[PDB]
Symmetry: D2
Subunit: 299 residues, 4 copies
């Protein structure tokens, strides 16, 4: 496998680079960054080897500037971390330029898949898909995957059940228009509504903590790096091994809502997004989902 991290100098980028360098399937990792980043990245690589300690002697790491993207050729996936820190529309445009440029350059080199993490992730995935000309199945963004994971952990801790028993999600925007799918939330297969303890669940407090998670972690340490990297590693594993798991990622929706990249349920595999799962949403859910889709169409 050959993955290219564009923005490997970042926090999420370097965390994910180290995590991927350890997988047995990673054979050619490509760390890309602007020219002033090159030296820095050459250091990252150094340390990434110091950790492997000779275990992966068939592993190869490459460092190149964002000028000579010819090394991207034949990459299975290209993960884009490049972006700028925080008005909302101002940031949308500022980062849209970067991601559109990178997508355009990537498509010129090869027909690959694109994993967008930069924010606003849904609109950034829209811009990437447009400026790449790629098919709707080969471009996707992190979207509300991390928020859904946090929500799942919260529910599981409340109910005192193992993490694997809880299956839920949060579709919508990676923002405040989130739409928790309580209709598609189950414990061991049971709908959560058939538990009596569901009436005691602090729903608003949980969802508010999830909405504010980025704010809190920015206030404390200046941004999340480890957890996002772990989630991205898991998504890459879902792709390379053709695992066909039902994730929640920002994808192009058309009738499943239309002409918008929003956080929806998706079956991920070797061929990227193989399916956008369309399911019946209760009334409030579908209303709020439409609202989130409007806000996301804005940018």
């Amino acid at each position: 496998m050959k993955v290219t991290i564009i923005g490997a100098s970042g926090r999420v980028g370097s965390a994910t680079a180290l995590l991927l360098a350890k997988e047995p399937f990673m054979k050619d990792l490509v760390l890309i960054g602007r020219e002033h980043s090159i030296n820095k990245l050459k250091g990252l690589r150094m340390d990434i080897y110091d950790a492997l300690a000779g275990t992966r002697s068939d592993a190869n790491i490459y460092v190149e500037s964002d000028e000579n993207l010819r090394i991207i050729d034949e990459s299975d996936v290209v993960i884009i971390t490049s972006g700028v820190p925080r008005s909302r529309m101002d940031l949308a445009k500022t980062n849209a330029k970067i991601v559109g440029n990178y997508a355009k350059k990537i498509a010129e080199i090869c027909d690959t898949k694109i994993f967008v993490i930069t924010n606003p992730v849904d609109v950034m995935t829209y811009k990437a898909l447009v400026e790449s000309k790629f098919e709707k199945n080969q471009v996707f963004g992190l979207g509300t995957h991390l928020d859904s994971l946090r929500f799942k952990v919260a529910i599981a801790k409340f109910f005192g059940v193992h993490i694997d028993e809880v299956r839920t999600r949060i579709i919508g925007e990676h923002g405040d228009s989130m739409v928790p799918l309580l209709s598609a939330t189950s414990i061991g297969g049971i709908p959560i509504q058939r538990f009596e303890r569901f009436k005691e669940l602090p729903i608003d407090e949980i969802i508010e903590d999830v909405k504010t998670y980025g704010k809190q972690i920015i206030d404390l340490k200046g941004g999340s790096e480890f957890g996002p990297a772990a989630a991205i590693l898991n998504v890459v594993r879902c792709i390379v091994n053709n695992e066909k798991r039902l994730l929640t990622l920002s994808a192009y929706v058309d009738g499943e809502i239309r002409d918008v990249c929003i956080g929806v349920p998706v079956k991920i595999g070797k061929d990227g997004i193989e399916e956008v799962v369309s399911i019946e949403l209760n009334k409030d859910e579908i209303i709020a989902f439409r609202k989130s889709a409007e806000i996301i169409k804005g940018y």
Copy 2:
């Protein structure tokens, strides 16, 4: 952890012993079998130590006949595999009684040494769990059997294959007897949290064929190689892992039920159960649709018959 396998001389016992010795928490493994088996049980041990190749030097494996069960003291879990095989000329009741004597005697002897948790694999597993509980006098949380765990796993894998999704995305179960009275719970089956009944390929699910294959798996594998040993041992390994790490998972096991379902009482049957360090932490009660509860009560009656006949 200190696990004891009574009947480790057998197929399932040997497989389970090998798989448990490989675990990082298995610090003392106790292999019990009748006296004529002692030498064989030593062989097993030797081979296991050959497989580890020194990777676990803190591991002790013991071999003792079923006469001197004092080596069981302080065991976390005692897995009972010892049992007689079904044969032509045996009614279901013949097997129930013949194996009830065995499991009941072993459970009474176990209770005489220590206060531990008993994991019944011997068949008819639901009835044998009932008998182990009766003769051991342990609490309703310390005795349980495999039951429909494996059948539920097979059903889950089948559904996942049909929908072409990862196995971890499918959550389903089969309650009732480890037998033809099985009751798959299609009401509490989901793919990614979505009920399967919302998917449009559900009307295309060959559910009848899947259920037939699950019910007949035992006969098929006995026809081919005389019995199942690898898969049952893997499932038992994961149940023991659920216990030792207090993972609090929602498994499907043969547990004692008293009212948690409508009209199920004084019976060991395959039900949903939250399993952790203290055994059966909870028997999950759930509203079954009309058909599910009708069939569940029928299976409960089938089990109650043999249970009544084996108590004394």
Copy 3:
């Protein structure tokens, strides 16, 4: 990867099939057997999948008879377990020739299909490796045997247990015949890079009893449970993992020795080898002390006698 176990219906064959099926580098596992075992193998397959419980969806397990060997094509390794047990009343030569027929015919057929590597488990492992390489027409780098790998592992674990160090710190070998003429190499035994001689406790080491047990293990385990199945399967798994990942470890295997040791030539015997994706990449040549080279000679002499009286059947 795609491995083929020829004799999967046996103890070692089935244990190895189970262990290999769990590996994530196993896309195609091919279980071969005589026709009368096709259903037994099917049973095996079923049970294996049962134990996998749907974790491996891209994995495929095939079952076949030993007449349609076309399924063996593109296989990275072919393990040979097919072989007859020594029955009381069998001389060493008798077992040699009987199992020679089997391994040789399987090797010739393997060659007829495609070019692959051949991992001989069948005992007398050294002679069987010789016969397989004969009838395969393959290069010497693509045919090897388990040989004295297990015995070396047992010796190492014993030393480690006595010195109270982790297993990974001990680095020893036992070369030569997988038999009574074993050759423990105390000249090349170290504990933390430090030759075991330098350790004062090497005086107290019960060397003789340890080697006694290493040599008697076979009949000890045959007398109790009838034979070995777990340890050999684990060792075979390690060798296969070394091949697939080109780990380039220095193992101790039955390899063809052409003058790499003084006096040893045209014989398959237990030697140090550097194993990789291309098979035996190097037969490592090292300076034995006096007694060790003498014993290695004699062991090679015995193996050569057997390899000669059987080389044409």
Copy 4:
């Protein structure tokens, strides 16, 4: 196990916190830092939990300031990362202050083993041993472990053999007074001198790069965070599981080697649940004894000048 990382806000500290928190033998991890870093460390903890994604529910990470060390009680190991980025003496003394005070407070609160990551690691291990008053089997430092590992990987890459086949060690100071031990280097139990290709080995360039790695990575990214954290994790796993491996660490040496005396220096050691269970005594060749005694002299100088601050 219950470990406590003093300096968890550092680079190495955070990397090690994340690696340890993933281990299943980690029931209680305690992240200690100065008061001004409290919020920061809290953030770290948050991130760590985010990376665990609910897998470790028996995991308990506690964050606290370096004033309320009461939480350190019952910790199996305490890893000290706190340090300052000057001459050599200047850094030695400045960090001796920090590590000595932390060792003394650790001793006040409870009894434990102290793993010194702070550099100059040999001198700092001496000062931890002093200000803690603990037994010598209880105070060690990373020392020349990483250097030995990089030397081993280089030999492995050259000879085209798996790393696990190479078994080498570098003893002495974590610095230019290093002493690569070619007398105790083997490749599969074969003395590497018996290999002919040893004569074509670029030995000196290898050793120079080993000496320069720290500065080289500091010239690019700021400092080492991942590799040191991995080696630390391996040493802690050897400690907790009583693995009985023969590592190369900074330990107190009292004549176990002919000439060495009252010096915390890098030597071969048998590590277990008891910390340094033994200093392995080896027969070195003339040149290696000479260089090792010189390294002892250097470290003794620094230790003498930082003995009472």
